Design a protein around this ligand. Structure first.
Ligand SMILES: [Fe+3]
Ligand SMILES: [Fe+3]
Ligand SMILES: [Fe+3]
Ligand SMILES: [Fe+3]
Lengths: 283, 281
């Protein structure tokens, strides 16, 4: 271990990402969440349960990324500066996770929150995706680890991010949505960066190896995609929003794929997101 | 793994420290380091070299704490909130270390800097304490890892922090001193928190194990103490300040022990640091 020298950058992107991520630092306390209290009261009991469950699902994924994911990529960094950026990513995943408790504390009741957490421990689709990702994080295959990480950063949270964006388009939970956008602002960069590092590693492999990884990527995606469909149908049952969430899933699945350097897999007719959602996503 | 719940804190100190460290977030870019350029030219060749070398050493430690330290402590966390707090500590360690490149960048030449790093790779004492600490961080002794970290956080740093606080009292490099002060504000809580967690683990050990760990701590503190002596009287050789530095490190060695729940090791006579310096702290 040698002292790190930030005046001898080996890959400029490391410094760009470091500056963008650190400059985008934030904490949930900085978001006036209490201003969503009236909006929360206008949601149905069903909608409130849905929101809480979705957020607990998001929390599990962030907790994993903070605990196992990010730190898992550490031993695979190719530059000392990458290691520093990964430590920031890990910390921010902790802030992301913590933010949901801030939301629960401000808007919800202890009883209903505890029930949601119980639900998360038992939901098959949720535990299945958590299991799939973790298995890759504990393995010894660095590139399958980055593929899983990108799918988590750019795909797996979106069945959840969709809800606050929808509510916001109706003028509800807008401050919660603002917070979600700060989280998304981070995840988008995380996925971009990890995907970038994955691409660099590919060039150091043969053509036969790069081809294996490509096939692995598409198979893992289909596995996660189908399980996410089941996760979505169950959570959004009877809301009438299932097909919109699915479109949002394909939309983000293509971005995850592109972050790994591959071409979009889902055609426009499966990834046609309602412009209202796209607008709320980036006003 | 379960989703963390910050509305079910298992130890209030976890929330306290999380709020302290996150509220105290900062970046070097936020410090007017440039306003020290004029004051940096007043320094001599020896001083400048000393400062750059001192800062390089500190940089290696933060790099270690960032890569090996804090990370190795996560597997030993006893609450989910502690794991989150440790990830913040690891992150800020990267910020601390990055700060030095920010300082070298605003007040030095690639020539000088590249020299201090070359030195860093060879200096015996420096490479030794780094070897000692990493040895524990990689071991499977959770409590020894915490003793090590507390020594790194509350002792092995001040051997350098002395200098920036000296210039500060003399009115030189006051901005850089503000930066260092920010680092200290973090390091101080880190040593306290990890030492706090160390003590909770102790109460759960046998009486004989508590004794063994106590003696061990002292054995490690001295091994690092004498090696820091060689480091000090060698780096501050041609300065005549070595005396002050020796007084400062004994001051911090005792603080490091308090953080572990132990009594002072060096008598006040050996820990009487120049009040002016303690003022810059
Ligand atoms: Fe996240
Ligand atoms: Fe992320
Ligand atoms: Fe530090
Ligand atoms: Fe520290």
């Amino acid at each position: 271990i040698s002292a790190i020298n930030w005046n001898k950058i080996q890959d400029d992107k490391d410094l760009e990402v470091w500056n963008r991520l650190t400059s985008n630092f934030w904490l949930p306390e900085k978001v006036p969440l209490s201003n969503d209290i009236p909006a929360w009261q206008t949601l149905s009991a069903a909608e409130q349960q849905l929101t809480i469950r979705v957020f607990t699902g998001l929390t599990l994924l962030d907790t994993i990324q903070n605990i196992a994911g990010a730190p898992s990529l550490m031993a695979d960094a190719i530059t000392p500066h990458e290691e520093a950026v990964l430590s920031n990513i890990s910390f921010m995943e902790a802030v992301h996770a913590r933010s949901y408790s801030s939301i629960f504390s401000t808007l919800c009741q202890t009883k209903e929150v505890d029930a949601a957490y119980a639900w998360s421990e038992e939901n098959p689709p949720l535990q299945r995706k958590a299991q799939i990702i973790l298995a890759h994080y504990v393995s010894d295959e660095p590139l399958k680890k980055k593929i899983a990480s990108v799918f988590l950063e750019s795909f797996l949270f979106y069945s959840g991010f969709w809800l606050p964006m929808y509510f916001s388009s109706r003028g509800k939970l807008t401050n919660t949505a603002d917070l979600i956008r700060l989280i998304i602002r981070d995840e988008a960069v995380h996925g971009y960066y990890i995907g970038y590092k994955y691409q660099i590693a590919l060039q150091k492999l043969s053509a036969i190896e790069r081809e294996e990884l490509k096939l692995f990527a598409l198979d893992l995606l289909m596995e996660l995609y189908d399980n996410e469909i089941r996760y979505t149908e169950a959570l959004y049952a009877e809301t009438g929003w299932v097909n919109d969430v699915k479109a949002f899933l394909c939309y983000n699945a293509n971005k995850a794929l592109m972050n790994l350097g591959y071409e979009a897999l889902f055609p426009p007719e499966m990834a046609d997101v309602n412009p209202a959602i796209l607008a709320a996503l980036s006003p």
